[PDB]
Amino acid sequence: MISLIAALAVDRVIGMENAMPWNLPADLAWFKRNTLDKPVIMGRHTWESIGRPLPGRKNIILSSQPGTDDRVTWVKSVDEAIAACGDVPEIMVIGGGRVYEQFLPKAQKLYLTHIDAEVEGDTHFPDYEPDDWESVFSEFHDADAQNSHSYCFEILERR
Amino acid sequence: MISLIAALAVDRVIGMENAMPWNLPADLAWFKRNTLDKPVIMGRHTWESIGRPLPGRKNIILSSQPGTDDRVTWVKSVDEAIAACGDVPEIMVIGGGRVYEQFLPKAQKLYLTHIDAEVEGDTHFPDYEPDDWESVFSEFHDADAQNSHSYCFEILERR
Numbered sequence A, B: 001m002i003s004l005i006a007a008l009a010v011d012r013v014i015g016m017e018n019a020m021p022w023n024l025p026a027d028l029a030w031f032k033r034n035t036l037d038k039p040v041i042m043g044r045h046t047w048e049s050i051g052r053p054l055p056g057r058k059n060i061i062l063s064s065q066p067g068t069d070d071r072v073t074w075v076k077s078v079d080e081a082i083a084a085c086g087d088v089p090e091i092m093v094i095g096g097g098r099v100y101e102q103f104l105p106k107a108q109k110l111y112l113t114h115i116d117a118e119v120e121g122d123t124h125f126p127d128y129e130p131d132d133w134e135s136v137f138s139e140f141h142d143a144d145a146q147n148s149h150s151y152c153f154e155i156l157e158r159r
């Protein structure tokens, strides 16, 4: 099954021209917890943003352009990306916008981090129909000594 | 010689308790480069936001409350903090507000990171009459894939 994992600010903003203006180690911990030991599929821009391969995961980069790093797997189609995953119970799609749009239709679950941040965004998470998804987990947290904004973790399963 | 190092948003607003709404790894690198191998003095809120002893530095916490942890030095007054430092060429004071207020009068150098972020806050870096201080170094940087905002490093010497 395919799952999408994303951090969304108000109005579904997922990316800006520069790094997102928040400091949320709790979100990174949640992301690591939910992606460890699974293949992760990402676009080139996300890859460049991370800076290195994510440890303990099979890193798959979906891009039309050619591969710049030998430590990860470079693919050119959604179909090739899927095949590269092998026989695994769950494949995680980590962004960005375009990638999420291409995988949404095939996704059965969403792991979402809603962040109370108002920002002008460049890219947005695709519009989902809340009537088509069932929230099976939610947990709210306020900003604290280490997290700059309040956020809420949510997991949704396709109805 | 006592130095204060701080990251300031517009209007000199500084953190109080919750993490600041920005992501500036360049500023943390700057921070590390200027404090490594030196004693650092911080208040209780700063300590909680860091979450662990800064490696390669002598960690001194100035607070009225008590020493939770044994890996760091707990002091109750300015004088005691100074003394805990021993005889070193430079003592770094890393915040927060009250701590900066207490040491400014005794400070000979300021390492400041001016960030182009408008943050609502109660706390401000103490007022310094820049004509009692000589700006010795200033280097601007634009925001990028890794740094959420534009920032400018500045070093000032007490004239």
Ligand SMILES: CN(Cc1cnc2nc(N)nc(N)c2n1)c1ccc(C(=O)N[C@@H](CCC(=O)O)C(=O)O)cc1
Binding pocket: A005, A006, A007, A027, A028, A029, A031, A032, A046, A049, A050, A054, A055, A093, A094, A095, A112, A113
């Ligand atoms: C820019 N970026 C993309 C990113 C960031 N936050 C997200 N948060 C959520 N919920 N979902 C995403 N898809 C997401 N993607 C990043 C950047 C760094 C790391 C990262 O360092 N992760 C470490 C965990 C944190 C650490 O070790 O500092 C890991 O092992 O996953 C992950 C994603």
Ligand SMILES: CN(Cc1cnc2nc(N)nc(N)c2n1)c1ccc(C(=O)N[C@@H](CCC(=O)O)C(=O)O)cc1
Binding pocket: B005, B006, B007, B027, B028, B029, B030, B031, B032, B046, B049, B050, B054, B055, B093, B094, B095, B112, B113
């Ligand atoms: C909350 N906090 C206080 C903090 C943050 N930025 C500042 N920035 C400046 N310029 N000045 C300060 N006094 C300052 N203080 C922190 C939090 C984490 C780290 C930190 O992790 N530092 C690592 C470097 C980054 C890393 O290893 O992730 C180090 O070795 O100094 C430092 C300060």
Ligand SMILES: [Ca+2]
Binding pocket: A134, A135, A136, A137
């Ligand atoms: Ca439910």
Ligand SMILES: [Cl-]
Binding pocket: A042, A043, A044, A045, A046, A047, A095, A096, A097, A099
């Ligand atoms: Cl991308």
Ligand SMILES: [Cl-]
Binding pocket: B042, B043, B044, B045, B046, B047, B095, B096, B097, B099
């Ligand atoms: Cl403090």
